Structure formats: structure tokens, C-alpha cells
Design a protein around this ligand. Structure first.
Ligand SMILES: NC(=O)c1ccc[n+]([C@@H]2O[C@H](COP(=O)([O-])OP(=O)(O)OC[C@H]3O[C@@H](n4cnc5c(N)ncnc54)[C@H](OP(=O)(O)O)[C@@H]3O)[C@@H](O)[C@H]2O)c1
Ligand SMILES: NC(=O)c1ccc[n+]([C@@H]2O[C@H](COP(=O)([O-])OP(=O)(O)OC[C@H]3O[C@@H](n4cnc5c(N)ncnc54)[C@H](OP(=O)(O)O)[C@@H]3O)[C@@H](O)[C@H]2O)c1
Ligand SMILES: NC(=O)c1ccc[n+]([C@@H]2O[C@H](COP(=O)([O-])OP(=O)(O)OC[C@H]3O[C@@H](n4cnc5c(N)ncnc54)[C@H](OP(=O)(O)O)[C@@H]3O)[C@@H](O)[C@H]2O)c1
Ligand SMILES: NC(=O)c1ccc[n+]([C@@H]2O[C@H](COP(=O)([O-])OP(=O)(O)OC[C@H]3O[C@@H](n4cnc5c(N)ncnc54)[C@H](OP(=O)(O)O)[C@@H]3O)[C@@H](O)[C@H]2O)c1
Ligand SMILES: [Zn+2]
Ligand SMILES: [Zn+2]
Ligand SMILES: [Zn+2]
Ligand SMILES: [Zn+2]
Lengths: 342, 342, 342, 342
């Protein structure tokens, strides 16, 4: 019996590297030897039961790798191909799915959450979830297609176009990918707010035209106020922090007629105040943006053509054995993305 | 000197019928003999200084009438024509105006607020604000084009289409016109929530497929709950009450992927709680809708073709002399729209 | 061995009723006892090889019926349920599919074309293609969900909204369903052009505000000319005839800023002249509309709620044995839809 | 009496530099000392009566300059300010205008066509047509805001977004500005077809990822064919040549589900063949794009922030006296934009 290492969430709180069998693919699956899988802040939440899951299960939902076996029903992608995986499996038979709102599937299953994921030497990827990318690419770059696709869906919703002004709240990997996607979609002012200096400097290397530090003073006045960066507000605010303060500032940063996109996840049940008078009189749009419906191919192509800076986003590369400790502890100071390389 | 009665807001709190000169039109104005002007809940707010204004000023911004004099620069509408007036004058030179967001003009002036309005025998209407409608029409029907246009802008924003399910919160004139516009835009379920029986019955006569009474139990469960009218939520919620409770219920009535449109005006500075987790995970849209940008002609045409029921919306017809008392007191029990006929 | 009648296209030109085995469902299929299947003009084309197919094959792609067996993997629709079938099976793995353009799937297979269809006592319907509708419904009404869904996609593309003016060219079943969907989507003028009197009268019974006869004079002048029904053109033209003349008139019927939607199928390779100067200077939109992407559930719900008149659309009800003759001959004089009842 | 040179179109065929009075502004006008006015191919058409005009009239509709006098009603832009002018004056009172389709105004008047334009030392610009830009800017850059705004409207219509693939047909100033706007709007492949080598090289300096020469072989195969640049077609084709061949190739370059935008002006009455079968079965959009509705401020801001390369677009700078000859003759070999500097 041929074995492999896998980082397994045994149950809420219990995570370790274990030896498991190499899975064998059904007729519509690909078996993929993982080149990289990214660690997400969702993975920490999954560990502490803050998001649901079906333990025991191999974590990891941000991965790419080389197809080493195809199932008998798969005929258009062969062994040797490189793919990135869309972890979100929609059912195709519920009313959300039949309306094209596949991200809102009521039977949604995610690879790395309800099915064994990418923190392992090998991972099973159903064919429909597999997106082919060039062999000439840097081997780890494909691991970014998933978080990039989430950001691209948000940027699509926002209406950013040539000449837009944009504020992004939060300088994690989502904020920083969003800075880049904002510039690519034509924004000529892209302001990023984040408390860490290192992350502000990185924002500027990957496209931010300015940055602000919310420790240093009132961000709303710094950005939107009479002597701020963009007096009267920006066209688009993208909230990428998932904390009450940034959600709360978002509408006051928007100009009249502007849009707020909520990418950040605030804990369930937690409440934040809005002012409906202002939403009406300034005709705002407040839009939730959830995962990656029909954008994975575009995301894969952006990475394939080198339109996105990926290398500066990688803070660290670790082994499978090191993963449980990194996932069990909070992120390090200037940390953007940690890649698990099996 | 030829005179006329006008209902004048002398200053905050002070309203009475006065004799004023018949205005003489500039070269781009029409002088219109008023056939009807509607009283709005905004008119009560204006009286008590809750919305700003430039007193002393003739109130009334929902009117139609017969052109009796044209200014020298006006050449395409002659004396004898019937028109309805768009009260909202945009400047055309500020950045909102140049972006096509004329409802967000930073120099906005409204007839009946910053300029003498329609509670008078005659009213001056700049040509660009005048929309011609048929002489064969019921003389008072034109007075509804303004509130109808506000509702039409909201319905446009909402995305209601053939087969949509819709909940409307508040059974004033805006709610009830919105019920009708929802059906016309293709909604096959249109549910109206309002506390007054009389207004629920009227809702059903003008297109509501069901009504609910928020006194009688939990509206959210009655509409969206497992054994409610539309289990799982409606496609579109239009909030037309302008109170904290309906704003607050709106998102919980929407299905995943749904839209909330805020038409109702909540007092400035007043705060209401949302749950950002739900907005994100259920990918909601929350949209403010403000007045009547580029929809006045369509609104006038809907009234001209008889697609909207207007007669059941008129609760009472009063004289100029009776107006100060009706405006100074709260609305009567089953009151929908009061028309001032000079 | 239990048998059934099926109308089989043996090969190009060869069509007859044959006895075939009752199919047995795979684990994701439903076996459906057909209550009705509609005959389409596409079925005549399929017979004469003008559209491709994989003979021998049972024709019929417009059907509804009662589930009599479920495959082992199907758990949410049981025997006894009534369903309508979406005949268009998309692959989910090609680039069109992954972009959400499932109607443009490059591996598209249609029930009744590449797979055995509904002109039989029983039909296999993969679960994802099955849409549940009420048992209380008229048994034959479900057979209209497919052509209705095609029309609904066209009407969605057109931008028809409250107060739109609309011309529809061609009074077959597509034109007539489109008249109804135009009114439901809020059009207040809906003009239908067709040469047959009987079909003009029917158009008026199901929502057309006027009709025109292209034999009787210049349709462009009758509709759009200075003394026509809508001087200067309509907002939306929907071409539903599939002949060179209606395609050619479409742009001249549209007002400046208007939209043309092409629903009609003109023979491959056939050419029609446009005037690019006019398309530019009058800023027209010309849009192709192809089948039924993500609209089948909405179509099924419109039929379920009785928002569409179906009974007046049924010209005749025939047996399986009568089908080969009706399909082999051209349509009769006032013929709208012929239903095959097994 | 203080005088100035002006390039005047005396009547069809007759163009020369003349001495005219310096105009005096009405109360809503600005008097602008011209820093630059661009020559357009429309100016040649105007000379030979191919487009209408109201001679005698000063030509020039692509200009910027310094405000030297304000009319008494103008209070927000003072002498000393730099502005670029929107030449297209809409009436605000026709049905197109009231629907927000200001580019389709039926009473449209253009500065440089129906009113004295920018080929003069001074030009009158009504305040609403004046867009302020920075004094720190290169003095001639403002002259590009008008053609840039036309291209921006086209790019908005096209739906180009992050990751789009694009073909542009014609390498004049419109094509080349469109290459730049395509890249800025997020296109990762931007292919430009033009016969002149010099213009292909320039396309590559300002953002084209590839270029093709339609003299060298079949452009449709070179771009969209099985071994072309983008097998199966691009997302967006923008036709910028205004000749029958490029209009005709446009649809065959588009992928299934793609968009064609027609910016190019083909002579009135001239006809080109389309294939309606292909438009339907490949669900294409063919969109006319006409001038600059509500995009002038965004265009001015793109030039103000330096997001567009302007200097490489200027082929030559000439005096007023040289203008009649340049306008009377066809454009020179590698000519992109000629600027008249008074
Ligand atoms: N919608 C979706 O489909 C989707 C997909 C993936 C992730 N997410 C969510 O998106 C959010 C960001 O994810 P991530 O992976 O980038 O997480 P992250 O590493 O937590 O990034 C968020 C960052 O926001 C910054 N921040 C905190 N408070 C702030 C404030 N008041 N103002 C400005 N910045 C502040 C922090 O950096 P400093 O320490 O420098 O301030 C923090 O690192 C999370 O809520 C995550 O759950 C959503
Ligand atoms: N966005 C715009 O451009 C625009 C334009 C015009 C007006 N407005 C605003 O729209 C709102 C409605 O105007 P209107 O003229 O129709 O005013 P209205 O006569 O005040 O109508 C609102 C109605 O809502 C009902 N209501 C109150 N609490 C409720 C609850 N908890 N649940 C359900 N219904 C409730 C009341 O009827 P019952 O007594 O039967 O409950 C009340 O009559 C106002 O806020 C107004 O300022 C906005
Ligand atoms: N896009 C899609 O997904 C889709 C789906 C289904 C069908 N289709 C296509 O849509 C078209 C209509 O289908 P159908 O089933 O309704 O077919 P149909 O029964 O052929 O209807 C077309 C009708 O157009 C009328 N007509 C012919 N020439 C005309 C003219 N010059 N002016 C006005 N009317 C004219 C005819 O009626 P009179 O004899 O009264 O003139 C004819 O009956 C066909 O081309 C079909 O292939 C497309
Ligand atoms: N929609 C609007 O609002 C708007 C605004 C301004 C201008 N326009 C129009 O847009 C068009 C372009 O204007 P422009 O000022 O850029 O004019 P231009 O200088 O005439 O540019 C068109 C260029 O197309 C190229 N061309 C000709 N035939 C070609 C072919 N078969 N394939 C590829 N390229 C070809 C030519 O360059 P080579 O010699 O290198 O081929 C020619 O220089 C004109 O029709 C103009 O009227 C429209
Ligand atoms: Zn689903
Ligand atoms: Zn303004
Ligand atoms: Zn496919
Ligand atoms: Zn106009």
C-alpha cells in the first residue's frame, strides 16, 4: 500500500500530519501531485470550529499541481498537465444553481473542508473543478488562483473602471491582490489602509498610489475629508479586513453615488450600525461578495499571463510537517501568504 | 395688479394662504395654471424644519396643469398644452451632473422647496422641467407623475423582472404605487406589509397578490419563514416606510442573492443594525434610491396610457384655503394622497 | 420485455412510429411518463437534415410528465412528481461552461436531437435537466416551459421594462409567447407583425396592443414612420420570423438608442445587409439570443402561476401515430403549437 | 476693434485663415485662449460637405486653453483656469435628452460645426461644456480629451474587463487611444490590425501585445483561426477604421458570446453583409458607439493623471496659417494627430 503525508484536521482543535493512503480516482476525477497549497485565515477558523467542516479531513483549498492519474471518464486532461483547483463544488440541481448563482448553492461542498484537500502529496480533483495552466509557469503560482478569483468577483461587482478612485480596507493577501486587480481594472487612484508598515510598503510595490495608517489618525478624514487624498469620497470602497471598524468606515469613505463591496468576513451574528438616511440621500450601493462564481478561468489566465505579481505575496514556504504549528498559531508580523510545499 | 392665492411657508412652523402676484415667466419658463398639486409627507417635514428650505416660499412639488404663457425663448410647448412638472432642477455643471448622476447634483433646487411651487393658482416651470401629457386625460392624473417617477427609479434599481417575488414594506402612496410598478415589471408574487386594513385592501385592488399585517405576528416568519408565503425569502424587498423596523427586517426577508431597495427616508443620524456576515454569505445587494433621474418621461407616459391606477389613490380633494390645516395636522386614518385643486 | 411507442428519426428523411424498449435509468436519471410533447419547426428541419442530429433517435424536446422511476443517486424528486425537461445538456468543463455561458457549450447535447426525446410514452431525463412543477396544473401546460424559456432569455436581453414600446416580427409560437412576455415585463405598446389574420387576432387576445399586416403595406412606415403607430421607432424590436425581410426591417423599426433582439433562425451562410452608419449614428444594439441559459426555473414558475396564456396557443392535440405525418408536412394555416399526447 | 486669426470654413470646399473679431461672451460663456486644437478626419469631411455644417464657421472641436474672460452668470471658473471643451451641446428638452441619452439629442449642436470652434486664438465655451484641468499639465494635452472620451464610451460599451482579449481594427488616433484604454480596462491581450508599419510599432509602444498586417494575409485566420493569436476569437472587437472590410471581419474575429463595438464611421447609405445565423448561434452583441455622453470628466482626469500616453500621438504641430493646407490635403504617411497651436 503506497502512502503519503497529509495535514489532517482530526476534529475541532486537533490537527497533525498523518500517513494516509494515496486516493484512487473515480471516473470523473484527476489525481494531482501537489506543487503548492496556500494557508488561508479560514484554515485557522476551521481548526477552532468557527466555520463548520466534516472532520476528519485533509485541509488545504488553495492549490496547484501535476496530474498523475486520470479517471476513465476523463478524456481532455492527461497526466503531465498542470492544473489549479476550484475547491467549491456546486450541486447543479438546487434553485440557486439553476439560476446560475452557483456560489450560493445550498448543497455546497469545498475541497479542504468537506473533502480531503491540498495539504498532502496528492489530492483528488473532480474534472469540472480543474483548470489547466501552462507548464512553463513558476510551479507555485497556481496556488494563488483561488484567492485571486475571490478578489476578481469582488472587483467585477464593484464597477471599477478606467479612471475610478478606490479605497481598500485591510492589507492581508485579499486586500493586496485587490489593490492589483483595482489597478488592472483601470482605477487611477488606489488607496490602501493597513496598520502594518511592511504591508503598506508592499501595497505600494504592487500598485497602490497611496497608503494610510489607521493608527495615525482618522482614516475617513485622511481619505475623504476636505483636505484628504480624495475630497468627497472615492468611487469604490472594498472592505477586506473583516472587522467592525472597516465595515463601519466603508460608507463614509464612498462619494455620493458610490459603491461599497464587502469581501471581509465578520463573525456570524455580529452587528454593525449603518445610517439609512445617508444610504438613501447619497444613493449608495452596499454589496456582499461571496467566493468565486464563473471567474476561475479568468483568474487562472491572469496568473498564466503574468499580469499579477505573485512572488512578493509569498512570505514563507514550509513543509507538510511544519504546517500544523503555523496553522495552530496566529500569523507572523508581516505575513501575507504562507505556501505549503509537499 | 392681478393676484392669486398661494399656500406659503412663511418660516419654520408658519404656513397660511396668501395673496401674491401672478409670476411672470423668464424666456425659458412656462406659466402653468395648476389643475392639481399633491400633498406629500415631505411637506409636513418642510413645515417643521426637518428638511431644509428657503422660506418664504410657496409649497407643492407634485403638480400638473395648463400652460397659459410661454417665455420668449420657449418655442416647442405653447399655451393650451397640459404638462406635469419635474420639481428637481439640477445644475448641469457639478461633477455629479457631468457624470449623469443628476439626482445627486450638489446644487439641487426643488420647485416647492427653494422655489415657489404648486399650491397656487399658477406656477412657473422652466421648460426643461416640463413634460407634456394628453389633454384627453383626467385633469388631476398628472399630479402623480412625480411620486410615480420616484417609485419607477426604485423599481429599475431593484432588478424586478418576469417571475420575480417581491415584498413591499409600507402602504403609503409610495408602497402602493410600488405594488403596481412591481406587477407591471413582471413580479408574479407581490406582498405588501402595512398595519392599516384599509390600505391592505387597497393594495389588493391595485395588484398585491397577498398582504401581511405586522401587528398580527412576525412579518419575517409570515413572509420568508419555513411555512410563510415565500419560504426562503423573496427576490426583492422595497422598503417604503422610513422607520427603523422595516429597514431592519428588509435583509432577513430577502432570499440569498436578493436585493433590498431603500426608498424610505429615515431621520438623519438615526442608526440601524445590519449583520455583515449575512450580507456577505448570502451575497445581498442593499441599494439606496433617491428621487427621479431620467425617469420623468417614462412616468408621464405610464399615466398617459392608463397603465397605473390613479383614482383609487386619491383619498381627498381640497381647496387652497383648506391646505394649511391638512398640512399642519398628521394624515387621517386611511389616507393615501390628498390633492389640492385651486 | 415491456415496450412502448416512440416517434423515431431513423435517418435524414425517414421518420416513423416504432416499438422500442422502455429505457432504464442510470443513477442520476428520472424515467418520465410523457403527458405532452410539443412539435417545433426545428423538428421539421431535423427530419430534412438542415440541423444536425445523431440518428436513429426519438424526436421531441418540449415535454412534461410524471416521474415513474428514479435512479439510485437521485434523492430529491420521487415517483409521482411532475416535471418539465430542459433538453439542453451542457458539459460543465469547456471554457464557455466555466464562464457561465452554458448555452454556448461546445459539447452541447439536446434531448430529442442527440438523445432519445419526448415523442414516446417514456423519456429519460437526467436530474439536473428536470424542473418540478405542481400536480394541480393542467397536464399539458409543462410542455411550453422550453419555448417560453427561450423567449424569456430574449426578453431579458432586450432590456424591455415598464413603459417600453416593442415591435415583434413573426406570429408563430415564439412571437406570440414573446408578445405575452413583453407585456409582463412592462411594455405598454406591443405591436405584432404577421401575415395571417388568425394569428393577428390571437396576438390581440394575448396582449398585443396593435397588430400590422406586412402584406397590406410598408411595415416600417406603418410602425415607425411619421404617421405610424410609434413615430420615430420603438424601444425594442424582437425578430421572431427567421426570414431575411424581418431581419432587414428590424433596425429601421428601432428608435435611436434602441435594441434589436434576433431570436429567429436564418439558414446558415445566408447574408443580410445592414447599414453601419445608422448603427453608429443612432447607437443601436443588435443582439443574438440563443436558447435557455439559467431561465428554465423562472419559465416553469410562470407557467405554474398561470401568468402566461397557454390554452389559446394549442392548435391541435395528436397521437404518437399521427406525429410522423404532421412532422413530414408543412404546418397548417392558423397553426401555433401542436401537442403530441401519448 | 481687437482681432484674431481663425481658420474658417466659408462654404463647402472653401477654407482659409481670416481675421475676425474676438468674440464676447454671454453670461454663461467662457472666453478661452486656445493652447491647442487637434485636426480630426471629420474636419476633412466637413470641408467637402460629407458631414453637414452651418458655414461660414470656424472649424476645430478638439481643444484646450486658458480662460481669459468669464460671463456674468459664471461664478465657479475664473480667468487663469485651464479647461478642455466638450464640443457637443445637447438641448436638455427633447425625449433623448430627458431619457439621459444626451449623445442622441435631436437638436445637437457641435462647437466647430454649427458654432465657431478652436482653430482660432480664442473660442467661446458655454460653462456646462467646460472641464477644468491642472495648470501643471503639458499645455497641449487637453486637446486629446475629446477623442479620448469617444474611445472611453466605446470601451465602456464593450464590457472589456480584467483578463479580456481584444482586437482593434484600424490604427488611426482612435484605434491607438483605444489600444491604451483596452489595456487600462484590464485586457491582457490587445491586438491591433493596421497596414502601416509605423503605426503598428507605435501601437506596441502604447500597449498592444501584438499587431497584424492585413496586407500580409487573412487577418481573421491570423487572429482567430486554429493557429492564430487567439484561436476561436477574442472577447471584444472594436472597429476603428470605418471601412467595409473591417466592419465585415469584426464578427468573425469575435469568440462565441463576444462583442463587436462599431466606432468607425462608414459613409451613409453604404451597406455591409452580416450572417444572422452566426449572430444568433454564437450569441453575439453588435453595438454602435456614438460620441461622448457623460464621459468627458473621466477623460479629462485620465489625461490629468498621466494614465494615457499623449506625446507619442502627436505627429506634428502647425500654425493657424498652415491649417487650411493640411486640412485640404489627405493625411501624411505615418500621421496620427496634427495639433494646431495658435
Ligand atoms: N468573500 C470571500 O469570498 C473571501 C475569500 C477569502 C477571504 N475572505 C475574508 O477576507 C478577509 C481578509 O482575508 P485575508 O486572508 O487577507 O486576512 P488577513 O490576513 O486577516 O487580512 C486582514 C488584514 O486587515 C488588517 N486590518 C485589521 N484591522 C484593520 C483596520 N481597522 N483598518 C485597516 N486594516 C485592518 C490587518 O492587517 P494590519 O495588521 O496591517 O492592519 C489584517 O492582516 C477575511 O475576513 C477573510 O475571511 C473572504
Ligand atoms: N426615495 C425617494 O425619492 C422618496 C420619494 C418620496 C417619498 N419618500 C419617502 O418614502 C417613505 C414613504 O412615503 P409615503 O408618502 O408613502 O409616506 P407614508 O404615508 O408615511 O407611508 C409610510 C407608511 O408605512 C406604514 N408603516 C409604518 N410602520 C410600518 C411597519 N413597521 N411595517 C409596515 N408598514 C409600516 C404606515 O402605514 P400603516 O399605518 O398602514 O402601517 C405609513 O403610512 C417616506 O419615508 C418618504 O419620506 C422617498
Ligand atoms: N433563439 C432560439 O433559441 C429559438 C428557439 C426556438 C425557435 N427559434 C426560431 O424562431 C423562429 C420562429 O419559430 P416559430 O416556432 O414561432 O416558427 P414559425 O411558426 O415559423 O413562426 C414564424 C412566423 O413568422 C411569420 N412570418 C413569416 N414571414 C414574415 C414577415 N415578412 N413578416 C412578419 N411575419 C412573418 C409566419 O407567420 P405568418 O404566416 O402569419 O406571417 C411564420 O409562421 C424560427 O426561426 C425558429 O427557428 C429560435
Ligand atoms: N464613434 C465616434 O464617436 C467617433 C469619434 C471620432 C472618430 N470616429 C471615426 O472613427 C474612425 C477612425 O478615426 P481616426 O481619426 O482614427 O481616422 P483614421 O486616421 O482614418 O484611422 C483609420 C485608419 O484605419 C486604417 N485602416 C484602413 N483600412 C484598414 C483595414 N482594412 N484594416 C485595418 N486598418 C485599416 C488606416 O491606417 P493604415 O493606413 O495603417 O491601415 C487608417 O489610418 C473614422 O471612421 C472616424 O470617422 C468616430
Ligand atoms: Zn446547488
Ligand atoms: Zn449639478
Ligand atoms: Zn460545455
Ligand atoms: Zn436634446
Amino acid at each position: 500500500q503506497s502512502m503519503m503525508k497529509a495535514v489532517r484536521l482530526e476534529s475541532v482543535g486537533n490537527i497533525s500530519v498523518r500517513n494516509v493512503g494515496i486516493p484512487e480516482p473515480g471516473p470523473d476525477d484527476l489525481l494531482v501531485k501537489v506543487e503548492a497549497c496556500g494557508i488561508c485565515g479560514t484554515d485557522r477558523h476551521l481548526l477552532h470550529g468557527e466555520f463548520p467542516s466534516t472532520p476528519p479531513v485533509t485541509l488545504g483549498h488553495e492549490f496547484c499541481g501535476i496530474v498523475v492519474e486520470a479517471g476513465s471518464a476523463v478524456r481532455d486532461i492527461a497526466p503531465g498537465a498542470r492544473i489549479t483547483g476550484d475547491p467549491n463544488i456546486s450541486c447543479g440541481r438546487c434553485p440557486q444553481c439553476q439560476a446560475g448563482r452557483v456560489n450560493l448553492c445550498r448543497n455546497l461542498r469545498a475541497i479542504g473542508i468537506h473533502r480531503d484537500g491540498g495539504f498532502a502529496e496528492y489530492v483528488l480533483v473532480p474534472r469540472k473543478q480543474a483548470f489547466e495552466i501552462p507548464l512553463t509557469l513558476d510551479p507555485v503560482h497556481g496556488a494563488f488562483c483561488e484567492p485571486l478569483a475571490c478578489c476578481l468577483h469582488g472587483v467585477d461587482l464593484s464597477g471599477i473602471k478606467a479612471g475610478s478612485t478606490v479605497a481598500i480596507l485591510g492589507g492581508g493577501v485579499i486586500g493586496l491582490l485587490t489593490v492589483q486587480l483595482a489597478r488592472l481594472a483601470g482605477a487611477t487612484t488606489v488607496i490602501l489602509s493597513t496598520r502594518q508598515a511592511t504591508k503598506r510598503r508592499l501595497a505600494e510595490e504592487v500598485g497602490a498610489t497611496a497608503t494610510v495608517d489607521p493608527s495615525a489618525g482618522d482614516v475617513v478624514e485622511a481619505i475623504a475629508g476636505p483636505v484628504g487624498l480624495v475630497p468627497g469620497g472615492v468611487d469604490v470602497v472594498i472592505e477586506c479586513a473583516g472587522v467592525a471598524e472597516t465595515v463601519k468606515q466603508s460608507t463614509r469613505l464612498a462619494k455620493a453615488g458610490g459603491t461599497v463591496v464587502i469581501l471581509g468576513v465578520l463573525p456570524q451574528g455580529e452587528k454593525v450600525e449603518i445610517e439609512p438616511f445617508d444610504i438613501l440621500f447619497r444613493e449608495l450601493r452596499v454589496l456582499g461578495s461571496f467566493i468565486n462564481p464563473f471567474v476561475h478561468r479568468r483568474a487562472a489566465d491572469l496568473v498564466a499571463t503574468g499580469a499579477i505579481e505573485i512572488d512578493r505575496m509569498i512570505s514563507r514556504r514550509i513543509s507538510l510537517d511544519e504546517a500544523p504549528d503555523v496553522i495552530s498559531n496566529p500569523a507572523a508580523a508581516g505575513e501575507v501568504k504562507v505556501l505549503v510545499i509537499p
